[PDB]
Write a protein that binds this ligand. Structure first.
Ligand SMILES: Cc1cc2nc3c(=O)[nH]c(=O)nc-3n(C[C@H](O)[C@H](O)[C@H](O)COP(=O)(O)O)c2cc1C
Ligand SMILES: Cc1cc2nc3c(=O)[nH]c(=O)nc-3n(C[C@H](O)[C@H](O)[C@H](O)COP(=O)(O)O)c2cc1C
Lengths: 230, 230
């Protein structure tokens, strides 16, 4: 299937990039897949400068058509699996990882990643791994993606890095083999019910509300039902 | 006194920028201070691309002298009070706020902000405020700065915004008046004692270790003692 990978790092000697490349190599060496590997080195994503009003109320995004933002969104929507990797810089995601996320912020309340499987990878010296994995988990999960697996590599436990990447590969293979099917979590279902109540009182011209109506997100008992019934 | 301000926002219609400009005006309208207001609109900070090895082990920074990073560091070290503001984008600091922080990542374990008073401001629509304020608090505090005050403005409670900004001003004025003196927290003392033990086994050629030696960070019983003594 199609696998989209993005590593948010600009350091030429990045260990995050190295491990991410290693992961990609393992997957393709064991499976016949179409991988799209993107980084700040081969993809240009200008820093997000959008305004809440235009972005959410009007659904306007002028940047994506000016750089690689557009093609990235297309590949994301066309992928079966998404792999996001980030270095741990000052106990937080890297600048490029944060920008990647802000560049798709418009999907924050649209569950556009519903049906996709997300794998996260973060690399640190010895701390901050948990805060980064948790932030990535929450963001992509909120967007509707299923967190298939998360990996945190640390120099402290570098000897298990290969084994950790191999374990991620096994999870991915279960998806490629059709052994794992998209399933929403309680956290996601609650987020769904919560957002619906808010968007229900929004103006009829509000882009997000119109999107929900057009996608029939309102006429559904749950997020999982919506996905499999619509 | 000298006050350094940085708003990490690239959105022309930013409410964060507007609220930060308001705080700046309030302060200068009641006090004689030297304010340096920087943002991505008047300052150039390339996205951080540093490598841990070179940055911490060798103390190499190849970007600061290439753009506005150098002058920003100088103003930070010369300032008495530091004000950092950030929009709340997907429950995290903005891309530019994250970059600002990474661009001074080299000071992570040097306590170079010891003696400075930090004020943070984050602006959100309705949520994610606490995660952003808590992150800024931890980062700047860990770097030695005293968190003088924190403000979280939300559209949900926009009616108290002015009052919130006035409260920040009073805190700042007490510093300018010389009422509040720099004092470390238990969080910082523990970080200090913890770092020392680590940098004690480091190679004699390690930049961070040599820095602590030259600054006499080793010959001290506590971080606060170190500050008022050395
Ligand atoms: C500005 C900067 C901040 C960093 N902060 C942390 C951190 O908070 N925790 C940690 O364990 N390692 C930290 N590191 C070390 C990296 O996590 C480590 O080098 C890892 O390999 C990821 O970075 P890389 O992809 O650039 O190699 C930092 C590195 C830099 C350059
Ligand atoms: C990409 C993007 C994601 C955002 N995420 C959040 C969020 O997580 N929580 C919230 O309450 N507001 C969120 N907002 C709304 C902003 O917090 C609000 O507009 C605030 O004024 C700060 O942004 P501004 O400085 O650009 O005005 C988001 C806005 C954008 C452009």
């Amino acid at each position: 299937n199609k696998i989209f990978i993005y590593a948010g790092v600009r350091n030429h000697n990045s260990k995050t990039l190295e491990y991410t490349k290693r992961l990609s190599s393992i997957i393709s060496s064991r499976n016949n897949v179409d991988i799209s590997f993107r980084t700040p080195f081969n993809s240009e994503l200008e820093i997000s400068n959008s305004d809440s009003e235009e972005l959410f109320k009007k659904g306007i995004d002028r940047q994506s058509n000016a750089d690689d933002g557009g093609v990235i969104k297309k590949e994301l929507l066309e992928s079966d699996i998404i792999i996001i990797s980030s270095p741990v810089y000052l106990q937080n995601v890297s600048v490029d990882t944060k920008n990647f996320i802000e560049r798709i912020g418009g999907w924050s309340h649209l569950f556009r990643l519903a049906g996709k499987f997300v794998v996260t990878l973060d690399v640190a010296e010895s701390n901050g791994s948990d805060n980064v994995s948790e932030y990535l988990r929450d963001i992509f999960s909120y967007m509707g993606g299923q967190i298939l697996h998360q990996v945190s590599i640390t120099n402290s436990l570098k000897d298990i890095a290969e084994a950790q990447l191999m374990e991620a590969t096994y999870k991915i293979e279960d998806v490629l083999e059709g052994k794992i099917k998209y399933k929403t979590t309680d956290y996601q279902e609650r987020a769904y019910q919560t957002l619906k109540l808010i968007l229900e009182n929004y103006d009829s011209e509000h882009f997000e509300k119109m999107y929900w109506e057009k996608k029939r997100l309102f006429e559904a008992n749950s997020l999982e039902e919506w996905y499999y019934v619509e």
